[PDB]
Design an enzyme around this catalytic site. Structure first.
Site, short mmCIF file in Angstrom:
data_model
loop_
_atom_site.label_atom_id
_atom_site.label_comp_id
_atom_site.label_asym_id
_atom_site.label_seq_id
_atom_site.Cartn_x
_atom_site.Cartn_y
_atom_site.Cartn_z
N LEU A 40 64.41 40.84 12.90
CA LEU A 40 63.88 40.46 14.20
C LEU A 40 62.45 40.95 14.36
O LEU A 40 61.95 41.76 13.58
CB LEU A 40 64.75 41.00 15.32
CG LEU A 40 66.20 40.52 15.34
CD1 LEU A 40 67.04 41.43 16.21
CD2 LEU A 40 66.28 39.09 15.82
N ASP A 41 61.79 40.44 15.40
CA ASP A 41 60.42 40.81 15.72
C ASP A 41 60.39 41.82 16.87
O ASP A 41 61.38 42.02 17.58
CB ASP A 41 59.62 39.56 16.10
CG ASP A 41 58.16 39.85 16.30
OD1 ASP A 41 57.58 40.58 15.47
OD2 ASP A 41 57.58 39.34 17.28
N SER A 42 59.24 42.47 17.02
CA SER A 42 59.10 43.46 18.08
C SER A 42 59.27 42.83 19.46
O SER A 42 59.89 43.43 20.35
CB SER A 42 57.74 44.15 17.96
OG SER A 42 56.75 43.23 17.54
N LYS G 51 49.90 35.54 17.88
CA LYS G 51 50.60 36.69 17.31
C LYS G 51 49.86 37.25 16.11
O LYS G 51 49.72 38.47 15.97
CB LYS G 51 52.02 36.28 16.91
CG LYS G 51 52.89 37.45 16.48
CD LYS G 51 54.35 37.14 16.68
CE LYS G 51 55.23 37.93 15.72
NZ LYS G 51 55.05 39.40 15.88
#
Ligand SMILES: CCCCCCCCCCCCCCCCCC(=O)OC[C@H](COP(=O)([O-])OCC(O)COP(=O)([O-])OC[C@@H](COC(=O)CCCCCCCCCCCCCCCCC)OC(=O)CCCCCCCCCCCCCCCCC)OC(=O)CCCCCCCCCCCCCCCCC
Ligand SMILES: CCCCCCCCCCCCCCCCCC(=O)OC[C@H](COP(=O)([O-])OCC(O)COP(=O)([O-])OC[C@@H](COC(=O)CCCCCCCCCCCCCCCCC)OC(=O)CCCCCCCCCCCCCCCCC)OC(=O)CCCCCCCCCCCCCCCCC
Ligand SMILES: CCCCCCCCCCCCCCCCCC(=O)OC[C@H](COP(=O)(O)OCCN)OC(=O)CCCCCCCCCCCCCCCCC
Lengths: 86, 62, 168, 113, 94, 459, 177, 154, 12, 111, 75, 165
Positions: A40-42, G51
């Site tokens: 997963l991402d932050s 991002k």
């Protein structure tokens, strides 16, 4: 009201993470890391903490929130804050 | 008494009936008072029209 | 209760004049109150009054004979000035109590008349006004150290003023 | 309404609430009977009527008070008398409105030459 | 992000101790070792009433102007209890 | 009066002849009984004031102060019982002797008939108070505080001596009854104005006027609890009492010689009350509160209406009791945390729940809670000053707001809030301290029941 | 509350904090859950649109613009969790969080009412007494040689030793006493 | 406490400044003395004028509600700036615009109140008529004197 | 089940 | 009239009863919230009576209980003015306080 | 304590489905819809209307009103 | 107003207690379905606050507005007063909507119990008050002020039209 318990918190945190789409409910486990094991991402972790915050009606100060990277750590944080296992 | 999670709790019949009874009492009271005392709302005494009154009515001289 | 010093007009309660089939709760509550509360309390009070009839004792209102006023005192004669001053103080506070009694009359009149007070209390308002004018002319502007001599000086100032006005 | 006329259009014709009446009571009334009261000053006092209440419908108000007292505890048996008293007050109010209208029309008349 | 190994170990150790303390806080079944109808109506609405009515009647009233009351309303056709006067009627209206 | 003076003197032999163990108990008990004896001065069933001899007299103005003085001594001993815990016996007995001597001198002063009695017995109070401040005080600056306290008053007093001597030369006597019954009008000469000042200045200094009030904030935050109590319960009222007794001769000069001091009082009251808002020393905050209240007293006395005098007397007594109680409370917390800062200790209602109740009641007395005699006094002084000039209500109202404000500020800062959990030394309230606060409050409540006792001569 | 703040924050921490704050304010603006989801997804789309920006100067400029927009669009009255700072009942129970050092002053007759609890407490006090010396030495020895320090404390390294400075962390009053 | 540890006079040289900083537990570069205006500030450090409301709320401060840690330099105006008093916290709207809006609302309200006073709203009716010489006797009038006959009509 | 609630000494 | 004044004073006496019970050791042994609720209920019931009297004869009373002090021609008496305003508001306040005092037990059981 | 089975929660036929459609129309999907699905379903299903909340018991009040009116006319 | 204001506060207290001490009307919803008694009494309270015909409020507020519209008055004061009368309806609707009509928003773990008699009975009593006391008091109180009863149709029903609008 019904007092909280360790296994109860584990059950509910697992429930929320299971309903999170990005996480496949099969791989999900109590000790499974988020960014590494679950990939997963932050931002995704931020949303996880927000969802658990909503679930339990209390806030995680972001300094402490950023550190919780696994469901076991979230359960332990909730337990420590709410003084569960008498 | 029983706490329920992510579900609609069963409602004890006491609170149901009592709430409906209080609401029905309110509506019965309003309807009855309207029927027997509709003056208070719709008006009391016919407010006249000053326009029609005749110079004879008010004793004006020409 | 000396009705003179504390005048109290007569009572004029009207007839029951009932026009309702329903029973008035007040009469029955009052009957119950009478029988239950008033009767035993009256018994107790009667017992106390009998006990007082036994062992009766008397107390007398003190009478203070008059003595020379400050006008009759030679300047610096502390011996007589003390007596004159004390007499004046007693008269001063008796006047205070007069004012209290008249103010109480005015208040009782207002309460009794109610919304007719704007007309039926005129007599007591007039009495109150006259007595307060008298009180002002007697004791007002006298310092906290009010004394018979200050009162005499004030009266003489006013009398000089009135004499001047009469002359002019 | 009359407020619109007074504040926007001309104000000479429109009255002023303080001034009414602003004309002699006889102009246009060859005979102008003076108002009548039913109750006496004494009765109006004994019934402890307040000064504002001591108007020309005093008799009706006194009847209302008498019947309320007589009907206690039942407080709902005074509807007819209360209706009559408020009707008397409504008649008085209409009389005052007619005073206002009179003054308006008279001022319109006075606006001459 | 994430705890360091030292932080994780410290938090685990403090967790164990914190939970031991919390369990310590439990009270045992014997812990609170304690060492060795109109009754209300009569004793709070009637006993006070006797005293209060005694005071009122036999002190307040006996003093002047203590208990003053506005005039009771008098109407036409009304009969005064004491004098016997009958207040006169009202002129009829159209 | 000699049935009250002599027992007070005999307390001293008792103090010094008692065994070391029973000395405190014996002196406290016999002092309470002397206080009881002092109530005989309330049997005034006539308007003729009491004159027990050629030397001693009493009045409606002097009886309440004398009874207050008698009442304070037992409480002073209880308050001092602790901080003298570990001193040698002779030193403890010296302290007790100083307090007994102070009571004797103050009672004699208030019961003196001749103003040159009063001028000697009034300044004799300086020695015991100076010793109490300087010898048993804690911090180093107590010496400086003692110097200020001594010399402000002496500079004030010497002109009083000169004026009194001139008065005696001019009149032939100094018995206050004779002065009252043979007074005569002064003329507006410059010499008479200088006199007026000479007579009034010593008392005004003892009633610290706004410009000469620097010796209270020092004397109080350098003096022990008993010193503070006696000081700002009785010593401060010496000035008011002297002013009341002596103003009779000084008329009619007052009409225009009071404008300066009325103005200084009515402004310094606001200034000091405001200072109370932003002060970090509880003892200082209480001292400045006292300064404001005495500002009111001075204004009323210098306007001289019946309301002024009666309300001034009532507020004199009320302030006595209330300020005393406040100082005992602050000393209670000081005996534990060994600091005078208000910020340091907080939330103490979580550990001293009842002493919090006493704190609340004291703060109410300070802020002037109706029907308390504190309010009654302030209300009547306000009525007097409003009559004097209808604009003073502005200053009075601003002061009322600020008074309530610092009064509640003390409570919120200390009693309420998170408990400073690091304070391990906070110990359960001593029965001594609780009884001391009760003995301060109960007289206030009883007098609020019976105000007639504490009215002045006028009413 | 259980971890000391860092000396500073990186772009990652700052942006994550902004993301959380903006999402919560967006929720406060959009009361209904469906509307909140609709707009929060767009918010994540915006946040991830940038991002991967490896020119940190432009990244910081973008973050500054985002923060200014946030301050322009923040809900005047946001949503505050009941116990969260600034929310009703934030400190509602601090009156009853009386500390443990008060029990030392209890009268023996009061301690009699609770016999066992105080025996356990005596055990705990014994444990703390024993562990103080070792934990102070542990901190003294683990102090960094350089002059760079952080609030974070060390764990128990040796065996049978309590973690350094643990008495205040443990024993803190229960949330709802 | 001794002289070196208690405050002192305005730091007049950089070595004095460094000694003062070490005394106040503040950095030599962060320490700034109050301006030498001779108002008693003297050596005390000039700290940022931000209320304790702004301090981090989630942090375990040594002195909690004060929100200050042990040994931290204390602002000269801490009593004013405590959480229970002045709050210098940022606001969602600028102070200038807030002042403009509040005062403008007040101005509009008072202006329109004046408009209403000048132009009242009333119903179209005559003044209420009372009997008996406008109730001369029972409205507070002497019996002896006779008021001007005030009449009413239909 | 039932947990000790620490309180400041009230005996005095 | 005796009943009216007696009831007016009894209302205050009843309202003070819980306070005095609070300043005693019986507070520990009784269920204080229920006792106070009951006292308020009874006080409301008592107040109803003077309300009825006023609704009947509309007589208003000045009742002077204690003479607190006399201040040179200004007595301060503990007075009571019972009339439309006072009587009706006492009834209403007692009713609402009865309800809220019963509800306080529920809302504050834990505290 | 019976936590309901997570498979129970679906979005189909619930108001959030429209949000999901309008999102995928933009190329976005929410991963959380199932978390809040519980609100828009089950006993919580159905939409309240202000008239319905107001007329809570109007039927019974109207029945009693008719009874009372008939009684008054009959007596 | 004492009655129904107290009742509204009690209903709000019931809601706040039953939910986890939540006081935001954004995290309250669908209360009408889950807490029938409290929502019913809250609706009665709101309808009393915005005087609907013949409830407790109407037996006072309507007469107040009548006198306002037909007495010599500051025109601006009259206008803002009427606007505020309507706006009371507006915010009462704010509550009745966001707290009782929309789909739920509270935390998942429902634990709602209002069946306690110490809560039900007091609110019952205050609701009976809000429903009858207005009429009882208004009809029993003695005459005091002559009310103005003659007026145009729009003035007579102004309060109702503005409130409903
Ligand atoms: C007409 C005139 C009417 C006047 C009314 C004016 C109203 C003014 C309002 C002031 C508000 C005061 C306030 O908020 O409460 C403060 C105070 C705080 O109470 P608390 O929070 O429960 O304190 C508990 C402690 O923290 C913890 O200790 P505790 O829980 O164990 O306490 C148990 C109980 C134990 O109480 C006692 O043991 C009382 C012993 C009393 C002895 C009195 C002797 C009198 C001697 C005469 C000679 O309470 C106390 O300890 C209180 C002791 C102090 C009472 C002093 C008496 C004050 C009377 C005021 C007049 O409450 C009061 O006791 C004041 C009484 C009520 C106000 C007066 C109402 C009139 C009643 C007259 C009878
Ligand atoms: C059927 C059953 C009927 C039951 C009733 C039975 C009555 C009965 O047995 O005979 C009563 C019988 C009286 O019969 P009596 O011949 O009619 O009375 C003769 C005198 O009136 C006797 O009068 P006294 O001079 O002997 O009265 C003694 C005095 C007791 O006082 C003392 O004598 C000192 C006691 C100190 C004790 C220290 C410990 O009692 C009081 O007067 C009450 C004290 C003052 C309390 C109220 C203070 C209010 C202050 C207001 C502040 C708030 C601001 C006002 C704002 C309003 C202004 C704007 O005995 C009693 O009076 C009862 C004993 C009194 C004990 C009270 C102690 C309270 C302290
Ligand atoms: C606290 C406030 C109470 C104020 C009222 C004082 C009541 C006690 C009292 O004063 O009784 C006096 C009575 C006769 O005394 P009296 O005629 O006034 O002359 C001598 C006065 N010592 O003699 C007595 O002392 C006792 C009389 C026998 C019966 C006991 C008296 C009970 C009175 C209770 C009602 C008092 C009013 C309560 C008002 C409360 C308002 C909050």
């Amino acid at each position: 009201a019904p007092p909280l318990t360790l296994d109860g918190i584990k059950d509910r945190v697992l429930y929320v993470l299971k309903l999170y789409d990005k996480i496949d409910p099969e791989k999900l486990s109590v000790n499974s890391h988020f960014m590494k094991d679950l990939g997963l991402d932050s931002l995704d972790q931020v949303e996880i903490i927000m969802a658990m915050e909503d679930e339990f009606g209390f806030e995680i100060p972001d300094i402490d929130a950023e550190k919780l990277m696994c469901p076991q750590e979230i359960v332990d944080y909730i337990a420590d804050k709410k003084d569960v296992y008498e | 008494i029983q706490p329920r999670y992510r579900e609609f709790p069963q409602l004890t019949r006491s609170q149901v009936i009592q709430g409906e009874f209080l609401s029905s009492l309110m509506w019965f009271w309003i309807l009855w008072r309207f029927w027997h005392d509709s003056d208070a709302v719709l008006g009391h005494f016919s407010y006249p029209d000053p326009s029609q009154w005749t110079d004879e009515e008010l004793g004006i001289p020409p | 209760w000396d009705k003179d010093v504390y005048p109290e007009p007569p009572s004029r309660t009207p007839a029951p004049s009932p026009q309702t089939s329903l029973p008035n709760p007040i009469t029955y509550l009052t009957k119950a109150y009478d029988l239950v509360v008033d009767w035993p309390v009256t018994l107790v009070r009667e017992f106390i009054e009998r006990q007082h009839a036994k062992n009766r004792t008397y107390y007398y209102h003190r009478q203070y004979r008059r003595v020379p006023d400050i006008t009759e005192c030679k300047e610096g004669d502390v011996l007589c000035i003390y007596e004159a001053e004390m007499q004046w103080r007693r008269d001063f506070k008796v006047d205070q109590e007069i004012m209290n009694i008249i103010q109480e009359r005015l208040k009782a009149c207002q309460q009794r008349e109610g919304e007719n007070y704007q007309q039926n209390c005129a007599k007591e308002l007039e009495q109150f006004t006259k007595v307060t004018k008298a009180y002002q002319d007697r004791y007002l502007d006298l310092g906290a150290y009010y004394s018979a001599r200050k009162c005499l000086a004030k009266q003489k100032q006013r009398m000089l003023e009135e004499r001047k006005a009469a002359r002019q | 309404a009359h407020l619109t006329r007074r504040y926007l259009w001309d104000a000479s014709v429109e009255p002023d609430p303080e001034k009414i009446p602003s004309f002699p009571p006889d102009l246009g009334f060859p005979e102008r009977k003076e108002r009548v009261m039913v109750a006496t000053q004494q009765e109006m006092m004994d019934a402890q009527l307040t000064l504002q209440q001591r108007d020309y419908c005093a008799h009706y108000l006194i009847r209302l008070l008498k019947c309320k007292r007589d009907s206690f505890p039942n407080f709902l048996a005074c509807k007819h008398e209360q209706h009559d008293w408020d009707y008397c007050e409504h008649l008085d109010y209409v009389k005052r409105m007619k005073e206002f209208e009179r003054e308006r029309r008279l001022l319109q008349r006075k606006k001459r030459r | 992000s994430g705890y360091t190994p030292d932080e994780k170990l410290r938090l685990q150790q403090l967790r164990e101790l914190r939970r031991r303390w919390l369990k310590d806080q439990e009270l045992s079944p014997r812990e609170p070792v304690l060492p060795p109808s109109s009754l209300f109506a009569v004793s709070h609405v009637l006993i006070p009433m006797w005293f209060v009515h005694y005071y009122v009647k036999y002190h307040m009233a006996t003093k002047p102007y203590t208990i003053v009351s506005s005039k009771p309303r008098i109407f036409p056709g009304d009969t005064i209890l004491e004098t016997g006067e009958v207040i006169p009627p009202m002129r009829d209206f159209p | 009066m000699l049935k009250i003076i002599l027992p007070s003197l005999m307390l001293l032999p008792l103090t010094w002849l008692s065994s070391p163990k029973k000395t405190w108990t014996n002196v406290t008990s016999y002092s309470f009984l002397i206080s009881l004896t002092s109530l005989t001065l309330l049997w005034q069933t006539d308007e003729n004031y009491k004159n027990f001899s050629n030397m001693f007299s009493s009045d409606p103005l002097s009886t309440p102060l004398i009874i207050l003085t008698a009442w304070l001594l037992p409480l002073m001993l209880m308050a001092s019982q602790n901080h003298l815990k570990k001193d040698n016996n002779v030193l403890q007995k010296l302290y007790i002797s100083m307090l007994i001597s102070l009571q004797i001198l103050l009672i004699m002063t208030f019961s003196a008939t001749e103003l040159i009695m009063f001028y000697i017995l009034f300044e004799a109070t300086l020695i015991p108070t100076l010793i109490i401040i300087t010898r048993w005080g804690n911090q180093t600056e107590r010496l400086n505080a003692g110097i200020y306290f001594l010399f402000y008053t002496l500079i004030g007093s010497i002109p009083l001596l000169i004026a009194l001597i001139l008065i005696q030369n001019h009149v032939g006597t100094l018995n206050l009854m004779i002065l009252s019954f043979t007074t005569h009008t002064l003329d507006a000469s410059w010499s008479n104005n200088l006199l007026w000042l000479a007579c009034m200045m010593a008392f005004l200094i003892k009633m610290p006027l706004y410009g000469v009030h620097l010796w209270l904030p020092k004397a109080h935050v350098e003096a022990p609890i008993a010193g503070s109590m006696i000081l700002a319960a009785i010593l401060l009222k010496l000035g008011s009492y002297g002013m009341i007794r002596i103003s009779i001769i000084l008329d009619p000069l007052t009409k225009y010689m009071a404008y300066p001091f009325i103005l200084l009082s009515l402004w310094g009251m606001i200034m000091t009350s405001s200072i109370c808002l932003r002060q970090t020393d509880l003892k200082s905050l209480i001292a400045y509160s006292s300064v404001s209240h005495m500002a009111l007293v001075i204004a009323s006395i210098m306007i001289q209406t019946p309301w002024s005098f009666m309300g001034a007397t009532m507020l004199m007594i009320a302030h006595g009791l209330t300020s005393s109680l406040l100082f005992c409370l602050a000393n209670s917390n000081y005996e534990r945390i060994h600091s005078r800062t208000m910020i340091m200790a907080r939330g103490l209602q979580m550990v001293f729940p009842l002493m919090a109740t006493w704190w609340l009641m004291a703060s109410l007395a300070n802020l002037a809670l109706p029907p308390s005699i504190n309010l009654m006094g302030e209300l009547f002084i306000t009525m007097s000053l409003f009559s004097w000039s209808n604009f003073t209500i502005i200053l009075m109202g601003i002061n009322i707001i600020i008074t309530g404000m610092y009064s509640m500020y003390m409570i919120i800062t200390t009693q309420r809030g998170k408990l400073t959990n690091h304070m391990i030394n906070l110990q359960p309230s001593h029965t001594r301290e609780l009884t001391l606060m009760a003995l301060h409050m109960i007289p206030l409540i009883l007098l609020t029941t019976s105000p007639k006792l504490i009215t002045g001569l006028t009413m | 509350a259980f971890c000391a703040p860092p000396a500073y924050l990186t772009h990652q921490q700052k942006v994550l904090r902004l993301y959380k704050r903006a999402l919560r304010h967006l929720e406060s603006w959009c009361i209904h859950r469906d509307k909140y989801r609709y707009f929060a997804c767009l918010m994540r789309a915006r946040f991830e649109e940038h991002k991967n920006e490896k020119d940190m100067m432009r990244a910081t400029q973008l973050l500054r613009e985002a923060e200014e927009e946030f301050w322009q669009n923040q809900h005047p009255q946001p949503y505050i969790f009941p116990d969260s700072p600034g929310g009703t009942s934030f400190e509602r129970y601090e009156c009853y969080k009386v500390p443990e050092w008060c029990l030392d002053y209890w009268h023996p007759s009061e301690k009699a009412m609770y016999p066992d609890y105080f025996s356990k407490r005596e055990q705990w006090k014994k444990l703390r007494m024993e562990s103080w010396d070792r934990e102070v030495k542990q901190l003294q020895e683990e102090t960094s040689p350089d002059g760079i320090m952080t609030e974070a404390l060390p764990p128990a390294r040796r065996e049978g030793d309590l973690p350094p400075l643990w008495w205040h962390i443990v024993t803190r009053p229960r949330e709802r006493p | 406490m001794t002289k070196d540890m208690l405050p002192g006079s305005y730091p007049r040289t950089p070595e004095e400044r460094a000694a003062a900083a070490k005394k106040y537990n503040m950095r030599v570069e962060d320490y700034e003395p109050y301006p030498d205006d001779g108002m008693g500030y003297g050596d005390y450090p000039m700290l940022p004028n931000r209320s304790q409301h702004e301090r981090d709320p989630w942090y375990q401060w040594d002195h909690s509600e004060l929100r200050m840690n042990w040994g931290e330099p204390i602002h000269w105006d801490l009593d004013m700036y405590i959480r229970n008093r002045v709050d210098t916290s940022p606001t969602p709207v600028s102070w200038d615009v807030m002042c403009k809006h509040l005062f403008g609302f007040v101005a509009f309200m008072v202006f329109m109140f004046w408009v209403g006073h000048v132009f009242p709203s009333y119903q179209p009716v005559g003044p209420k008529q009372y009997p008996y010489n406008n109730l001369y006797l029972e409205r507070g009038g002497d019996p002896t004197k006779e008021p001007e006959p005030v009449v009413h009509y239909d | 089940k039932r947990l000790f609630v620490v309180k400041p000494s009230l005996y005095y | 009239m005796n009943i009216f004044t007696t009831s007016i004073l009894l209302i205050f006496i009843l309202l003070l009863s819980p306070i005095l019970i609070s300043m005693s050791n019986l507070i520990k042994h009784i269920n204080f919230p229920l006792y106070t609720t009951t006292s308020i209920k009874f006080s409301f019931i008592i107040s109803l009576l003077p309300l009825l009297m006023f609704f009947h004869n509309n007589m208003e009373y000045m009742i002077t209980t204690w003479h607190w002090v006399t201040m040179n021609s200004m007595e301060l008496k503990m007075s009571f003015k019972t009339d439309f305003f006072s009587i009706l508001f006492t009834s209403v306040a007692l009713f609402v306080t009865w309800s809220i005092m019963q509800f306080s037990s529920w809302y504050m059981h834990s505290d | 304590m019976e936590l309901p089975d997570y498979r129970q929660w679906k979005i189909e036929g619930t108001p959030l489905e429209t949000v999901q459609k309008k999102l995928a129309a933009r190329g976005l999907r929410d991963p959380w819809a199932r978390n809040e699905a519980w609100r828009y379903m089950g006993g919580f299903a159905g939409n309240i209307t202000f008239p319905s909340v107001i007329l809570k018991g109007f039927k019974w009040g109207f029945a009693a009103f008719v009874v009372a009116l008939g009684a008054e006319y009959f007596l | 107003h004492a009655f129904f204001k107290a009742m509204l506060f009690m209903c709000s207290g019931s809601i706040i207690h039953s939910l986890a001490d939540e006081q935001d009307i954004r995290k309250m919803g669908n209360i009408t379905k889950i807490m029938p008694f409290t929502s019913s009494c809250l609706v009665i309270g709101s309808l009393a606050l915005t005087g609907m015909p013949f409830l407790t409020g109407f037996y006072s507020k309507d007469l107040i507005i009548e006198a306002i519209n037909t007495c010599n008055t500051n025109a601006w004061a009259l206008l803002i007063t009427l606007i505020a009368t309507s706006m009371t309806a507006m915010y009462s609707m704010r509550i009745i909507y966001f707290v009782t009509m929309t789909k739920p928003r509270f935390p998942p773990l429902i634990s709602i119990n209002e069946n306690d008699p110490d809560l039900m009975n007091p609110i019952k009593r205050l609701a009976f008050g809000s429903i009858f006391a207005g009429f009882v008091i208004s009809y029993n109180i003695p005459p005091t002020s002559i009310p103005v009863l003659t007026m145009p149709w729009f003035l007579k029903t102004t309060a109702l039209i503005i409130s409903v609008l």
